[PDB]
Subunit: 225 residues, 6 copies
Amino acid sequence: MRIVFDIGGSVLVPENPDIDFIKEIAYQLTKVSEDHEVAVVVGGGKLARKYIEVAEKFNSSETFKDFIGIQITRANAMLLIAALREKAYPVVVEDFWEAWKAVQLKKIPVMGGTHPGHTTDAVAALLAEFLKADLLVVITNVDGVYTADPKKDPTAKKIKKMKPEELLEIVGKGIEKAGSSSVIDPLAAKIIARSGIKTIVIGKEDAKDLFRVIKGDHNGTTIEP
Amino acid sequence: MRIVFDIGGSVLVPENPDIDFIKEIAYQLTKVSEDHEVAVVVGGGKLARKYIEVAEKFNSSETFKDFIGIQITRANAMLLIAALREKAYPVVVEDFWEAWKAVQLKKIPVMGGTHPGHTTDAVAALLAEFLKADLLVVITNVDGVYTADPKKDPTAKKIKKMKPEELLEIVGKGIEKAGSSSVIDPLAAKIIARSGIKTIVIGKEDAKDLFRVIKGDHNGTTIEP
Amino acid sequence: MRIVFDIGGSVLVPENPDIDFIKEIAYQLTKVSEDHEVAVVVGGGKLARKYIEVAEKFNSSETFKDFIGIQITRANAMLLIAALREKAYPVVVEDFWEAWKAVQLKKIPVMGGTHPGHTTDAVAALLAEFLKADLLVVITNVDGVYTADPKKDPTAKKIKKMKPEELLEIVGKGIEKAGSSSVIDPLAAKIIARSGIKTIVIGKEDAKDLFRVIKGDHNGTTIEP
Amino acid sequence: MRIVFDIGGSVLVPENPDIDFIKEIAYQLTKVSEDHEVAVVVGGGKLARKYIEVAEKFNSSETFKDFIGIQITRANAMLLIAALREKAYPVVVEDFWEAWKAVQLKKIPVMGGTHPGHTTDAVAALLAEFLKADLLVVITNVDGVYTADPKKDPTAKKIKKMKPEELLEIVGKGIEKAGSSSVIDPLAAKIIARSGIKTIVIGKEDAKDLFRVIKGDHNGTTIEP
Amino acid sequence: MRIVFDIGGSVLVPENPDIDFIKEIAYQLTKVSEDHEVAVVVGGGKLARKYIEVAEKFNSSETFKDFIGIQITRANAMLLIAALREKAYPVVVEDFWEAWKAVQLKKIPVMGGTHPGHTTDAVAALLAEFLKADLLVVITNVDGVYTADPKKDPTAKKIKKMKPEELLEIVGKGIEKAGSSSVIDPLAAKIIARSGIKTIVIGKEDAKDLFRVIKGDHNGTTIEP
Amino acid sequence: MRIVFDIGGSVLVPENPDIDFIKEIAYQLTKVSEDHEVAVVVGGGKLARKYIEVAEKFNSSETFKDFIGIQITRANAMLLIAALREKAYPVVVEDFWEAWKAVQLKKIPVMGGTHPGHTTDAVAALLAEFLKADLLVVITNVDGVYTADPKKDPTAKKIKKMKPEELLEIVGKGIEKAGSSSVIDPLAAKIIARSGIKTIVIGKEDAKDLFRVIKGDHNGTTIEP
Ligand SMILES: Nc1ncnc2c1ncn2[C@@H]1O[C@H](COP(=O)(O)OP(=O)(O)NP(=O)(O)O)[C@@H](O)[C@H]1O
Ligand SMILES: Nc1ncnc2c1ncn2[C@@H]1O[C@H](COP(=O)(O)OP(=O)(O)NP(=O)(O)O)[C@@H](O)[C@H]1O
Ligand SMILES: Nc1ncnc2c1ncn2[C@@H]1O[C@H](COP(=O)(O)OP(=O)(O)NP(=O)(O)O)[C@@H](O)[C@H]1O
Ligand SMILES: Nc1ncnc2c1ncn2[C@@H]1O[C@H](COP(=O)(O)OP(=O)(O)NP(=O)(O)O)[C@@H](O)[C@H]1O
Ligand SMILES: Nc1ncnc2c1ncn2[C@@H]1O[C@H](COP(=O)(O)OP(=O)(O)NP(=O)(O)O)[C@@H](O)[C@H]1O
Ligand SMILES: Nc1ncnc2c1ncn2[C@@H]1O[C@H](COP(=O)(O)OP(=O)(O)NP(=O)(O)O)[C@@H](O)[C@H]1O
Ligand SMILES: [Mg+2]
Ligand SMILES: [Mg+2]
Ligand SMILES: [Mg+2]
Ligand SMILES: [Mg+2]
Ligand SMILES: [Mg+2]
Ligand SMILES: [Mg+2]
């Protein structure tokens, strides 16, 4: 199976780089690649947000900001590339067809952001469609997908399995949210529907044993028609 | 003042180019650019759609389909440059920084698409925000922004002016209509909404006299806060 | 065997894209690549000529025109890349060494034009020499190579086998024709002589069963010392 | 006159950016650039070191470690540009030729690192030599060039002036200290030694008034022949 | 007026550079460029031929052989730039658009080869057409265009003037002599023929005074319609 | 075993290209690659020095000079690429990760210089570290490493085996020599220490039978902790 991992930056670099988690996920990844094709996309996280802010205080364009965020995601991506030793594609990948080449060479392509105007979630969902992958795996700072924000609405429960259409609902069906953040960012959630690619929304815990996550023996959310 | 023209491909290259119009529009741009900072983003039109449909038939990804789209828009981009002679940038522009330079060399940067995930309208709007443009002139293939697709609900007429919020509704603010065409791409519109940059929408007729157009005298829609 | 296919644009896109032919040639190609190395070069065709004209009406340089033509050939090339599914190199190739890489990865590199100053025939003959290929296959809007223009001179017969020197004659030994069109463009025909690479000039018919075309069981022309 | 500012990353982006200082330093640069040719190379600071240390943990090569470093310096480079608004080059500069252009467009080229094997100081010095700069202003995180690392041997005070040869000794001219940081990178120093270009070393305090600084009035070190 | 100088490599870098001539020719160019738009394409000379011959020995393709050629021409291109100091573009130019920019920044773009399949002469001529140059000055290693290769048929003398058609014959218009050197590359000549741009052919002697040269006063050949 | 060969330009191109040596080393290399991974780095040599000089006479920056030198090393590198037939990576490699790709494709990447500020020795030592190679092989115009310059100090003997620390001594522990030439250039010798990679310093003789050189049955110097 060809699998894509969309690792939220907040998870990889909460405040500083989570050395331990990195070593772990790397290990888990190196593990899964033994008998699967693996592509990864890393998030910017906290550090990204901070750099974005400074730019805001100088009123730079959305485009300009994105570029900065991208620079950062790529800085994080290279941390994993480092942890993955001789198993990952040598340098940060910047576009799908190059990621494709990496897969061909039986190596793990790790991507930061691509071009301006795309959240890591969206970039991941697309890198998936492009590679014609089987599963999209989202590690995030949340247990799974809840009927409502777990960190707010008390009447919020975790959904173990749902259809892309329902996911689009939970997250947000507003063309205003286009580009916002969430369990799964509105635009990515959209693509996932269009693509109908099976997605798993797990957290920092389940990520510890990807083998089970892959085969279902996990405690997250699963999305697919 | 800085203006950004969003010329429809189907307007510059209908089914088979209106050499006359092209010269007319090119000249106009030349004049306007004499006492203005002019940037121009062009469409791929019907030609693009065909090529994209073919790709659609072979179940090619969204990204690949967009590459084809971009590739064609830039073909058209060329024709304009050929028409703008020695006033335009010699090459089609691909990124905003390059477009910025053109402005410095006091030359007109003509762009096609930039990268996947961005309709021409969007690219234009984002450009207008990047360059801090004062106005965004959308020369589409329709008279203006009607209460509904003219070809669909003839119980419609245009709307000389309106709020960005009003626009988002005429084009359906459904997080799924992201990527559609319409008189103005949905996502592009929402971009204008948060940027609040004055946007005019005209047809090829008004397009014949840009000075009158940019000087508020026209028969299209003048969207803004 | 390593084989190069120089598919005339007129054949691929007569007026519009020949969907059927595309699906067929794709199928045939996907077939031949099963036990051969395959590189393709696609032509601009009708659509290319039209865009070139507009540029002429604005008196753009030969160089400028070529670029436009190239843009188009690449647009066509991507149509095949699409039809070839997961067998072709993901994106349009722009230069030999990159095409080389594609061959290494056991994928089919499809090229449009390379740089200004080279017809698809020439680009194909060269891509061949570079890859040190065994056979050059030319699909064109003609049955084969005739003693004279089939669509004019009545005393024109099809030659089943000839030497590169004779081909150079038929086509044209004038350093004035350098860059013109024909069964085989003068410059390409020249290279074919220099390279002495076996070439087969077939048409839209023979292209339907490449297996026989490859092994000789075809009805075209064969060129080789 | 042509001046090249070597702004420390830890000075522009301490642990969390001094928006105030950044505006102050950016403005200053704007003024100075009014009657001077200004080029600016920026550092990655503490942030870079962390990311590099992480890489160090996974035994990544020197080259890869430098890529990460470069990648971060250019993130910072951005923030300055965001601050320099319409006077700076829109993009971070990567090579000197590009930096040269910026100078022509009378814009300020802001650079991060260029390629592996070159500390920020070095890159700056080499730049100053490339552009034939008259002065090299090193705004580090220390008051000046002390007879010894202040944090180490408190029996030290600074040295208002000195010879390039004197500098090489304060930073240990051991062919192994090549790549170290210090108030001024060892290799960078030796570069200044053979180029003999006047170099000032100040802190963020003096950095607040560049006019006074470049006009010899400051409290740092003014290294030269 | 816009002029394009086609400086022979063997003239700028004989067997071992004429520092004197180089300064002389560089200065001249500087003066001429004061009230003219100057573009310069340079050759690889004897040095190129050697390296290419070596490649020839290992049966390397035409394309690869040209890459080596290009690679060397650009080495020379450098030396001129080093000589043109602050008036030339800092980098060797590779494409015409870049050469166009140089013209805008009122700097002299010095080019080597561009891509395979184009002799220096050709590249120059195509450049002259691209930039809409008024004259094409070919500074070859010979006095002028003789009725026959001086080193071959001593029964020859030069021809002060002539028609482009006359040129094509002195260099053999055989569709096989495409790629040869001669006083003027065959293909280059035919390019001049259809472009009909005034072309002067001189030696290093007349080359010493370009003002007199471009002002019709010289002893070479002035080819034109 | 993965092996890197740092072939001194002086050896490859003493005066002119040493055709014979090239054919030999190529043969030897093609031989060793049969059961090893091989990366090569070629030097500029005599020809490089000459071009550098001309630039010096026009007082160009160190950076500018390096670029020229690089151009040349790459010209030499392509000579080997030619000799290596269908065994080497098609074109000259310009950076490590690309060289990495070449190794993956079981091809021999031949590099000239990388970016300014690095001698071929240094570039080689680094390309080694990057690829995590087992042995660094230096062919030079000298028998091996001597206690002192063989071509000067009579009390100079050849050392058959030593530790990187001692090598750093012989060659030079001065941060002033940083960038100079020698058996092993000071900076490269430094890296070799840091990397502790086994290095063999042989000459034009031993290079004739790489199989023995590889397994120790040679007459050069060996460096390793
Ligand atoms: N219905 C929901 N279910 C789960 N999380 C939700 C929901 N609604 C909102 N959220 C929020 O989604 C957050 C999740 O994702 P997010 O903060 O964007 O991190 P990330 O994407 O993992 N990181 P990065 O790529 O660096 O941004 C939670 O911590 C919640 O505050
Ligand atoms: N409310 C509306 N007002 C006007 N046109 C509308 C509206 N709603 C939908 N449309 C459609 O918008 C179409 C307009 O734009 P579109 O087809 O996308 O062309 P274009 O943008 O000019 N060309 P190009 O850049 O090549 O795609 C019309 O012909 C209608 O079918
Ligand atoms: N002796 C000949 N034998 C065969 N065809 C000839 C001959 N002489 C001239 N022709 C012409 O060659 C044409 C063939 O090629 P051409 O029109 O250039 O198409 P193409 O190369 O297949 N397409 P493209 O790559 O898009 O240009 C025919 O249809 C004839 O009009
Ligand atoms: N003789 C000296 N004088 C002053 N500082 C010294 C001296 N010797 C060593 N140092 C050290 O130099 C440090 C200074 O520079 P450095 O840490 O490299 O910061 P930076 O260059 O400003 N930042 P950046 O560009 O992000 O690395 C001090 O804090 C000292 O620990
Ligand atoms: N009719 C002619 N008139 C003058 N030279 C001729 C003629 N026919 C052939 N030649 C040859 O042209 C040679 C001239 O040019 P060429 O050797 O190609 O040098 P170049 O172009 O100056 N150098 P470069 O750019 O490095 O190749 C002479 O030395 C002759 O051998
Ligand atoms: N201790 C030493 N042992 C051996 N050679 C020495 C020593 N000290 C100095 N040398 C010099 O090192 C020279 C060796 O290397 P060098 O001239 O730099 O050639 P290269 O590196 O092989 N070529 P290239 O890559 O083109 O510069 C000899 O010929 C000596 O003049
Ligand atoms: Mg997320
Ligand atoms: Mg539209
Ligand atoms: Mg043809
Ligand atoms: Mg420092
Ligand atoms: Mg010549
Ligand atoms: Mg050496």
